[PDB]
């Protein structure tokens, strides 16, 4: 295809994820398979990576993403920060693309919960926040340009394995403990132990707004026990809340597709349907943590009152596949199957791949999945988009 | 734990609550989770339910509980009735347990302000009322046995989420309108509308003494506007007066622990401490009415001169947690942390549970709280008490 835009690609992780220099250089985007950002740069697709709080709400992460792109000090909004009891200002960044203040566009490619954060960033850029604007006028405080509206610079959002209607994993009985055991399993993929008191930071959870940081001498085991009891686990201003079916529906009520952005979704599944009742079971080769800890639950949990039924049981080890083609619960967004022409302002469902939640970013091996081709094909499609 | 007594359990609601035939059978004790009295009976713990005026004083409610238990016409006392301007006599009941007049006893399990009513019932059984005794002699009128003193039929009182020292919620500026909105939120949890003039009674406020009742053609919205302007909201002979920190301390000056009764308290909390100034905020999953309307105030209102300081900020969405382990303000009662042996004549503090004020009775969902095991374990402990 012909190139029709010059927008760089920006990569955005989910409820785990870390910058290029973290985790001893093991990349979230490529894991044991390599460095996806480097593959794209090397093939002429200019690509950058964002690293935002993995456990923070999509709102917090969107404010962090905005400052990382345009430069400046993260501003969560005076109204938001007062309502949830955390700092209004966060870190200060130079900016990856401070030109976006003047003009120019990006493509966001986001995995897992990054797809919620990317959708939310577009809604804030284009429409701002009326609550923040009214609060700033009422209290005579400053207002970040993010909350003004009028700053739409995202040509496309592509989501990969995103829980747009949530994941039923949040409902599992031991979910608090098992979710932090999933963080430990991702550390272990990077050869990072959870019982070692690392002096270097290794994996920064970016919880400056809550005042939390792993302390000198503290193992990840000990630190996650503190995080389980902290506001980033127990408040509604969290990844945990937005990950749930309840909280993803609430997000979908206000975060709509912009008519100025192409949305693409990729769905993932790594399960088979059983012969007894319709439940789903992990396939050979699914990442071991998901296969043992998460997929049996995801493939069997129903909630008839919420209509969480047999269609929700197929999963990729972490998220129910039905959740991933676009927001539907609480959403008026349109979802169309890809027909060869990518359309603005709707979700173009690019299909369902037999790859698990961690294999699709290369964190878990899968030699039958040609991960480099997958990301290069996608970059060629995004470069074809007509602004 | 081996059973040591055969006393039945009697359940007692707070400033909302209704009998088993009210609310089209949606139970206060169990709500959306089921029927706690039925669970208890089906496991061999004989259990009954009281229904007294939700908005009436603890004194009125204790006279009503007395009559419902032993049988007969509610008698509020000639001196009390003349002092406050209401009828001396209320409804007539058949009596759930007339064997209490021949030696039978009960365990009361009480929620919310029910714990103040249960303590007041025990105080009146033990000591009566010298004012009533004086007045009956002076005016040559009859006297209820409740006011004589020298009676005993309560083996134990267990309080759950009770404001023994009051709740600061009453100091909210628009408390009147938000308290009746709480009543409407509880009706909505029971799938009852507030703008429909139901011909059946549905929720009887048992205001016979005040001469108030919902009229034909009157919705709950219109009825609650009248109640707000009526003596059951504007006088001192009300749940409103006894709910406040001021009124709870006045109650504690005369309602003391009996040496012949075990007292157990359960405390509840559903908040996190923020990172700005140590205020408390509602956790994810708190009932929506409390989370929006009540918890932000409860977690941020301080009054150092009245001793309302950091200890009062943690709360369950309706009552400050520090108020719930037993009466302290204006009280000489002893409170001891449970140590595996329950003690008579003192408050056995059974701990604090991460469950909100409505979750603890099942009116609001919380799948992580095993409400059936909670009540069954409590009934087994009460059955183990030595008589
Ligand atoms: Ca694999
Ligand atoms: Ca709840
Ligand atoms: Cl180190
Ligand atoms: Cl810390
Ligand atoms: Cl950290
Ligand atoms: Cl099956
Ligand atoms: Cl591989
Ligand atoms: Cl007994
Ligand atoms: Cl008694
Ligand atoms: Cl009337
Ligand atoms: Cl705070
Ligand atoms: Cl539940
Ligand atoms: Na505040
Ligand atoms: Na840290
Ligand atoms: Na499959
Ligand atoms: Na298949
Ligand atoms: Na929809
Ligand atoms: Na109904
Ligand atoms: Na808490
Ligand atoms: Na005291
Ligand atoms: Na819990
Ligand atoms: Zn926030
Ligand atoms: Zn009265």
Swiss-Prot record, chains A, B:
Active-site positions, per UniProt? 112, 316, 357
Give temperature effects on activity. Answer: Optimum temperature is 70 degrees Celsius. Highly thermostable with a half-life of 315 minutes at 60 degrees Celsius, 125 minutes at 65 degrees Celsius and 45 minutes at 70 degrees Celsius.
Q: Which reaction does this enzyme catalyse, per its entry? A: a triacylglycerol + H2O = a diacylglycerol + a fatty acid + H(+)
Q: Does the keyword Lipid metabolism apply?
A: yes
Provide the protein name: Lipase
Principal location: secreted
Reported EC number(s) for this entry are 3.1.1.3
InterPro entries per record:
AB_hydrolase_fold, Lip-like_C
Query: Which top EC class is named for this enzyme in its record?
Result: hydrolase
- What's the family? Belongs to the AB hydrolase superfamily.
């Amino acid at each position: 295809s012909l190139r029709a835009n010059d927008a760089p690609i920006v990569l955005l992780h989910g409820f785990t994820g870390w910058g290029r220099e973290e985790m001893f250089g093991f990349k979230y985007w490529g894991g044991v398979r390599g460095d996806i950002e480097q593959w794209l740069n090397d093939n002429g697709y200019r690509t950058y990576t964002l690293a935002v709080g993995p456990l923070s709400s999509n709102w917090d992460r969107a404010c962090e993403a905005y400052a990382q792109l345009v430069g400046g000090t993260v501003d969560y909004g005076a109204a938001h920060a007062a309502k949830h009891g955390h700092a209004r200002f966060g870190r200060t960044y130079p900016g990856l693309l401070p030109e976006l203040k003047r003009g120019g566009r990006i493509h966001i490619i986001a995995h897992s919960q990054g797809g919620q954060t990317a959708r939310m960033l577009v809604s804030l850029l284009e429409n701002g926040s009326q609550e923040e604007r009214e609060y700033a006028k009422a209290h005579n405080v400053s207002l970040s340009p993010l909350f003004e509206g009028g700053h739409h610079f995202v040509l496309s959002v592509t989501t990969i394995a995103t829980p747009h209607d949530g994941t039923t994993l949040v409902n599992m009985v031991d979910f608090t403990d098992r979710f932090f055991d999933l963080q430990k399993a991702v550390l272990e993929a990077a050869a990072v132990a959870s019982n070692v008191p690392y002096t270097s930071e290794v994996y920064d959870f970016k919880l400056d707004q809550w005042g939390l940081r792993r302390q000198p001498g503290e193992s990840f085991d000990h630190y996650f026990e503190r995080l389980k009891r902290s506001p980033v686990w127990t408040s509604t201003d969290t990844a945990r809340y937005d990950l749930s079916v309840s909280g993803a529906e609430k997000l979908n009520q206000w975060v709509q597709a912009s008519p100025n952005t192409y949305y693409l979704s990729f769905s993932t599944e790594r399960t088979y349907r059983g012969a007894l009742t319709g439940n789903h079971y992990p396939e050979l080769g699914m990442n071991a943590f998901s296969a043992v800890v998460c997929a049996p639950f995801l493939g069997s949990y129903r909630n008839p009152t919420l209509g969480i039924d047999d269609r929700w049981l197929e999963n990729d080890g972490i998220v129910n596949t039905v959740s991933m083609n676009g927001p539907k619960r609480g959403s008026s967004d349109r979802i169309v199957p890809y027909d060869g022409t990518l359309k603005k302002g709707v979700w173009n469902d690019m299909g369902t791949y037999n790859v698990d939640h961690l294999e699709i970013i290369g964190v878990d091996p899968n030699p039958s999945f040609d991960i480099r081709a997958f990301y290069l094909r996608l970059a060629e499609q995004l470069a074809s988009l007509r602004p």
